Input
Amino acid sequence: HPFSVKVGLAQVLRGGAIVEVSSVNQAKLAESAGACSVIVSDPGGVRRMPDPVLIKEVKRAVSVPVMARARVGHFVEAQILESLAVDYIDESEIISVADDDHFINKHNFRSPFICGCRDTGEALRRIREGAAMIRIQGDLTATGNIAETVKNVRSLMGEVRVLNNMDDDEVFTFAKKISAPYDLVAQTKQMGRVPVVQFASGGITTPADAALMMQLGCDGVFVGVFDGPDPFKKLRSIVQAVQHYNDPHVLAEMSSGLENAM
Amino acid sequence: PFSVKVGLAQVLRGGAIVEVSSVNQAKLAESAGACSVIVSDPGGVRRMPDPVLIKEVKRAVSVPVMARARVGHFVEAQILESLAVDYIDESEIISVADDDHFINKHNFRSPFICGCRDTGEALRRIREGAAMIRIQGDLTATGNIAETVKNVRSLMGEVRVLNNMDDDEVFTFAKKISAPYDLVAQTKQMGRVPVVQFASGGITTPADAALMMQLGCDGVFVGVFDGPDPFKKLRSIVQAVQHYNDPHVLAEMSSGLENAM
Amino acid sequence: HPFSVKVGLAQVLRGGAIVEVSSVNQAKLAESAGACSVIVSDPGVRRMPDPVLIKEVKRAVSVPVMARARVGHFVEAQILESLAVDYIDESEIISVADDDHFINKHNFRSPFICGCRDTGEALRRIREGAAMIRIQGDLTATGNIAETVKNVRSLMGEVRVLNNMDDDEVFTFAKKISAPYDLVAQTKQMGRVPVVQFASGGITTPADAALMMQLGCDGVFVGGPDPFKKLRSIVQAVQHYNDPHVLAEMSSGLENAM
Amino acid sequence: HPFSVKVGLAQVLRGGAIVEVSSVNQAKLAESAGACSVIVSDPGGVRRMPDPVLIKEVKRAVSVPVMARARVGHFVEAQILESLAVDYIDESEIISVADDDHFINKHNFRSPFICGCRDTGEALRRIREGAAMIRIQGDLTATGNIAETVKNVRSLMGEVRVLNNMDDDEVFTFAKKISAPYDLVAQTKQMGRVPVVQFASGGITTPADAALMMQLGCDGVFVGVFDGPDPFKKLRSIVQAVQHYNDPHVLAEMSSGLENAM
Amino acid sequence: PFSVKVGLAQMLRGGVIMDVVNAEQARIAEEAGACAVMALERVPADIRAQGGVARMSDPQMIKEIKQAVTIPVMAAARIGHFVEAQILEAIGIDYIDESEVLTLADEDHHINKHNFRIPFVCGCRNLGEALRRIREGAAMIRTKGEAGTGNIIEAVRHVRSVNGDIRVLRNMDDDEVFTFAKKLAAPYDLVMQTKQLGRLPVVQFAAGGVATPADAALMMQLGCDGVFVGIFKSGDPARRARAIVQAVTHYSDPEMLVEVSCGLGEAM
Output
């Protein structure tokens, strides 16, 4: 399907960090430190898809894929981003929701979408609408706290394990309970995984945080590093961290004299 | 010696266990393939059965004889161990004599079976000293297998969840079901309840019996006599447990049994 | 003390069963099976038994004779003491005559038993002057031993808690079980409740009677079929509460219980 | 018993005021004005037994008995005070509780303890633990208001009167209800009094307040006078007041041109 | 290897561990008889007062310490943050404290402390919570207490909680322990094992609210093997610190307690 092709595009991000930038300067730094992508962002107040002149500028200043966010259910915003020819769209509950009853019909775009989730049904529901990639929403806000993120990764991975070993006869009732499409459930069982790239996001603040998500079994992380004291340094470390997550002596060195986190 | 009782009870896998209240009933049961019988002389207060009766049954049959004690009534169990029963059922079907504690089953030579409604409960009876678990349903003579299916599914299902769970998360899992952590890891590594697991409660037909088996149990209890012709019904159920995955066998077995309960 | 003496009188009953009779006939039956004592009764409003009755029963047998007064019915007790029963049971099994206050048992020479469902209750009866404590079970003839067990357990249990407890923490413990601190401190030392402790409520079989004994009781109270047989059996059971072989032969063909 | 000896030590305070001091200056004033004792105190924040160098200094600057407070249930604090050889310890709910389930086992000390109370059972329970003296807690804080104090003295004295005239048969149930040791209840009945010195404290602020407590039937008062305008003057007055409580013309003169209370 | 981590913590009995956030301090702690230090980046009083997310401390500051004192060095790792732990094992600390004083990083699960060759100290507020941490691998328990208030009332609650039910457990009818284990929500083995031994099959310490010599000594008198302290928020860190140490090693000696508390200055 054109869906596999999208699912396929999101696979080349496996093993990377995705940094959130709001200028060109910030994008040129994230790419330098080894980000495998940069997501373009505006930054209370209402938060929307960022200006195209800015998405244009970044797209140009870096050779890594460019992502941008669209408000949930704001399909016109997503049409614009597609038109600008960015590589990925993140239907992002981080900015101001625009439709509280419906998300984008992501099967109407060429672009591969990411959607956030807090549990398995949320992820399978986003997928069925046409998400080609998932991220465990976690603690939104700039709270620097991974708890909710760990909670959400844990719920997911664990829910999939329960599913994997389930009596086939019970999977129907299970599908009903998490409010997810049965066949995408049955799929997830067959593959013992969520049929799409699964990143962690929310509250990642230290090489250690990043390596924990990876050890929990994620495909990579998002980081939102510029509210720090040495963003290049810290960002390098998180890349190194994600790249060498099972290596404590490496993780130790990356964390050394890092300067203040948030 | 626990492994010895656990090992002993294994000789029941594949069987149907019949509740009898007389020698005339324990016989019908053996002479129909009962792999063991469970004695009682049955509202009101229902207690251990009379030792005389038990001796009559024990003498009138070669199969292992089991008997009922009230929950927490150790002495009733001392008595039963004395008359030399092969198995003691600390059974909630009978008026509980202790609402806070169960017989410390590791103080006895005889093997104990207990009831359970879920994994945690089974793992708790086992740490106490049960060498065999039966998954109960209706405690009342209801002829309905619904609650029974609930508890067998619940049991199996948690074991399966546990079977594949991240080691780091078993501790909290043992907390949430209030079970001893090491019997829960034993159960994880084995992928199963470290003891024989029978279904009990509501079993009234070959189909009922055969469903529990297909659901993963090692055997079934039945209480048959609530019927039109118990001899035919009993063989039927036995055959049913014997040939549970064979639909043609089951159809024959069910044909013209008379009315159930 | 005159209390010490009273506590001594009940200690003769240690190791026995106390049958509950309401005639001469029953009291004879009970006496032959080896009942250490008998408690007189009549069976609405339940009261102290009739003194003619309590007198026929006293003459008919040779073992100690008890009788029930209503809770707080001090007069009723005065009467029993006068016709010279050996023990008085201020018994919640018959109708309560005072809801707020128990008989001030000290003002009596005849020794008192009182019921209890836990340690606080038992000590409180003791302070008022109970020389003997009996667990309470089901107040009805429910032939069910469950609550009985609960109450022996709670009692046995909190005493064990007590014995080992930090001394500084016993005051607060005294408060929480509403008990006189100085009886709590005695009990702690003695690692025991300073009086005879009989289970009662729902003893219907030898097994039941024996269970009570193995849980630590000093004896038991007992309320058709074959009474003399069953009675013998329960007495035999309390006398050999550790012999599963005897518990076995004892229980064989006792005919139907209640 | 060694308990009577302690009960006995606290009797020599009958008819006096006990002033609360936090320096040496304050102690030298209270003694001058005729205080029959001074209680050493620290002074939101956590309040503990005061420094030994300070308890040492007062003990020296005055010839009147020295009291000091220990946090409730802080038996080590009390061991220290004993070691310093002060005359009395007040297990004082005025400073920061240290054990909310247990008070000091006061029978393990040589020192006579005081404990506060709001009712009779509280007082009998403190006594049974080994308080050799009682004070009606009243309104803690520096509220200058005697109401709670009057409430608490009233409850006590009155509860004892009820007890005094009670049918002996009912005293058991009474003991149960106020949660007090029956034999200490039976005692209090025999003597128609609380078997220990009973002072008033909390909110005493004027000669009149002090004389009211005495007329209510107390053995004396505590005063906590230095948050006033003329502490010597006021303190003299309160001593005079307590000393001449049934003398209104005297009480009148003591109250005259006193300066501001609190 | 559990037996051995447990063992390794025996060396701490009668000890006063001290929280620090730099060499100067750690130097002050040993320089006063602190049996071990527990390096961080903020002391608990400041954590409460200043908010923010409290995480493992930066290696650097953990190394600059371990290279200024001879006594064992501990460090805190956010509850459940097994990767923070790792980074600590690597760096070579003596003990890791999976500390609820720092920002909980996993609400549902604690670090699996067995998967480590380094010994863990876990917080507790009651017996069960202690028997659960031990089963997860904790070698050395402590009380949650109350962190950053200078009020010792909660440590007392907890210490008493645990010692209490332990004594209850010691003399409990053998047939009643099962049930006791359910209600405790603790592993039956570990319970029976605490019954047999009459105490916590690992080193037990007090923590949270210890601010004066009397405090520390009360803990010891209540039945603790040592105390934690978070000392630098007071007036003369040295005197007070030496005093608290002296306090734990002379806990049953009032006369000395009076001596060691004499003019120590303003506490917290």
Notes: Strands of chain D lie at 16-21, 38-40, 66-70, 88-91, 113-117, 131-136, 198-200, 220-223. The longest strand of chain D covers residues 16-21.
